[PDB]
Amino acid sequence: MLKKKQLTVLDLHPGAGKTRRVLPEIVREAIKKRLRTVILAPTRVVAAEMEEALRGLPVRYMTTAVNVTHSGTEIVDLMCHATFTSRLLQPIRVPNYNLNIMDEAHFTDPSSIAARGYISTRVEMGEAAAIFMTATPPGTRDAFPDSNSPIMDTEVEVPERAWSSGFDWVTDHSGKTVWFVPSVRNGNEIAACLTKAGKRVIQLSRKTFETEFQKTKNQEWDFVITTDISEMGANFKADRVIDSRRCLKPVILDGERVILAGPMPVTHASAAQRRGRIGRNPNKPGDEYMYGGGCAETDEGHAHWLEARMLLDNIYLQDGLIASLYRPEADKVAAIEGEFKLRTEQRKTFVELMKRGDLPVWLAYQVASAGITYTDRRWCFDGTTNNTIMEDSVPAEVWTKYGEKRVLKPRWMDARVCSDHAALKSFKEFAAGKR
Numbered sequence: 001m002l003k004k005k006q007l008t009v010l011d012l013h014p015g016a017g018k019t020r021r022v023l024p025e026i027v028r029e030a031i032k033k034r035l036r037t038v039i040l041a042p043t044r045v046v047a048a049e050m051e052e053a054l055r056g057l058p059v060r061y062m063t064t065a066v067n068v069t070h071s072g073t074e075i076v077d078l079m080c081h082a083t084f085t086s087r088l089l090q091p092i093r094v095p096n097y098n099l100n101i102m103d104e105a106h107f108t109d110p111s112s113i114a115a116r117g118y119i120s121t122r123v124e125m126g127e128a129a130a131i132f133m134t135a136t137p138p139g140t141r142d143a144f145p146d147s148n149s150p151i152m153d154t155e156v157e158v159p160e161r162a163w164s165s166g167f168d169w170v171t172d173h174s175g176k177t178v179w180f181v182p183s184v185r186n187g188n189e190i191a192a193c194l195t196k197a198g199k200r201v202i203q204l205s206r207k208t209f210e211t212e213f214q215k216t217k218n219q220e221w222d223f224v225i226t227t228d229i230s231e232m233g234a235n236f237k238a239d240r241v242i243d244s245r246r247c248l249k250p251v252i253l254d255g256e257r258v259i260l261a262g263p264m265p266v267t268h269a270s271a272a273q274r275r276g277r278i279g280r281n282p283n284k285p286g287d288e289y290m291y292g293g294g295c296a297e298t299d300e301g302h303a304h305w306l307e308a309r310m311l312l313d314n315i316y317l318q319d320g321l322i323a324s325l326y327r328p329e330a331d332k333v334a335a336i337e338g339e340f341k342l343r344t345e346q347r348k349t350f351v352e353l354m355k356r357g358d359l360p361v362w363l364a365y366q367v368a369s370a371g372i373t374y375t376d377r378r379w380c381f382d383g384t385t386n387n388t389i390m391e392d393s394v395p396a397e398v399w400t401k402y403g404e405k406r407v408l409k410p411r412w413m414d415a416r417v418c419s420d421h422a423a424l425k426s427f428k429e430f431a432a433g434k435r
C-alpha cells in the first residue's frame with residue numbers, strides 16, 4: 001500500500017475495524033519506513049477517537065480537539081480534512097507527505113473533495129502514496145453492505161412533519177434510535193413532536209456537532225435527530241436507524257444564485273452510511289433500519305463539486321499546473337481546470353471570506369472575483385428586492401458598520417447563508433461588519 005504512485009481504497013464494510021485495527025498497523029509500518037505521513041479526520045470528534053486508537057504512537061495532533069504534549073519527534077501528522085485544504089490555500093508551507101491517509105473518505109463537503117483531488121493528483125504524478133478509507137467509495141451502487149451483525153431492513157413511510165396518528169411504530173419502540181432528517185429545520189419539527197410525546201431528544205448538525213455529540217455519551221436519550229453529518233464516522237449505542245432517505249442539494253442557477261433544492265433522495269453511499277450506524281455489534285443481531293424512500297445519484301450537478309474546483313484552482317501544485325478532481329468523482333461537475341484561478345490579492349480575499357467570514361465557497365468566490373475587499377460589506381445591501389432575505393416572514397434588517405438600519409439584500413444570493421436561524425444570525429453579523 002505504502003509504495004509511491006499507489007492509491008489504495010480500503011473498502012472494508014462499516015464497522016470492520018478500518019480505524020481501530022487497520023489504521024494503527026498502517027501507521028507503525030509508515031514510521032518503520034520513515035514515510036512523512038498525514039492522517040485526515042473528517043471531524044474533531046473522529047480526531048479524538050483516532051487519538052484513542054493510536055495512543056502510544058508518535059503522532060502530532062494538529063487540532064485542539066486533543067490535549068497532548070508533543071515530543072517533536074513525530075513524522076506522522078493528524079489534522080481535519082478542512083484544516084489540510086485550508087493550510088494548502090494559505091501562504092503556509094505544507095510538507096509534501098510521502099503517505100496520505102484519509103479516514104471517512106466518502107465525505108462530500110467541498111474541502112474534503114478538494115483534498116482527495118490534490119492527493120490523487122500527487123499520486124498520479126508519481127510523487128506520493130495514498131490510502132482512502134471508506135466502505136462507500138464514489139459511485140457505489142450498494143445501499144445495503146455487509147455488517148457485523150444481521151440488520152432488519154424495512155421500507156416504510158417515515159414522517160417528515162409532526163404527526164398525531166399513523167406512525168405508532170416510531171414511538172412504541174423502547175430502544176435508542178438515530179433518525180436522519182434532510183435539514184435542521186425539519187429535525188426541529190420532528191424533535192418538538194417527539195419531545196411533546198415524552199421522548200428525550202438530542203439534535204445534531206454541522207455547527208453544533210462537537211458539543212451536542214458529547215450529550216449522547218453524558219446523558220440518557222431516546223432519539224438522536226441528525227442531518228447527514230452523522231454519516232462521517234459518528235458512532236452511537238443504538239438499536240434502530242430511521243432514515244428519511246432525503247437530503248438538500250445546493251444548486252447554482254444561471255451561475256448567479258445558489259438555492260437549496262429538494263428535499264430529494266440521498267445517494268447509495270449516504271444511505272449505506274446512515275444504515276451503517278447500526279448492526280455494528282456482533283453480539284446484538286436484529287438492529288432495525290427503517291427507510292422512507294429510494295436512492296438516486298443526486299451528487300451530479302451538486303454545487304459542492306463546483307466549489308471543490310474553485311478551491312483546487314487556487315492551490316499551488318507546480319508552476320501553472322492545477323490538481324484535478326479524484327477520477328471516480330470528476331464527472332459530477334462540468335468545469336474546466338483553471339477557470340476559477342484568481343490573482344494574488346483576489347485569492348487572499350477569497351481565502352479570508354471563507355476562513356474568517358465563514359461564507360460558503362461559491363459566495364466567497366463571487367465577492368473576491370468582483371474585486372471587493374474583505375471588509376467592504378456594501379454588497380450585502382445593494383441586490384435586487386428578489387434577493388431580500390426574510391426573517392419570521394418580514395425582511396431581515398441589520399445596523400451597518402456606518403450605524404444605518406438597512407434591509408439585508410445581498411448582491412449574490414446563496415440560500416446557505418439563511419438555511420436556519422443560526423446561519424442567518426451569523427450572516428447578519430457579517431453584514432454588520434462584526435467579523
Ligand SMILES: CC(C)c1cc2ncccc2[nH]1
Binds near residue numbers: 060061062063064
Ligand atoms: C494543537 C494545535 C495548537 C496545533 C499543533 C500544531 N502543530 C503544527 C502546526 C499547527 C498546529 N496546531
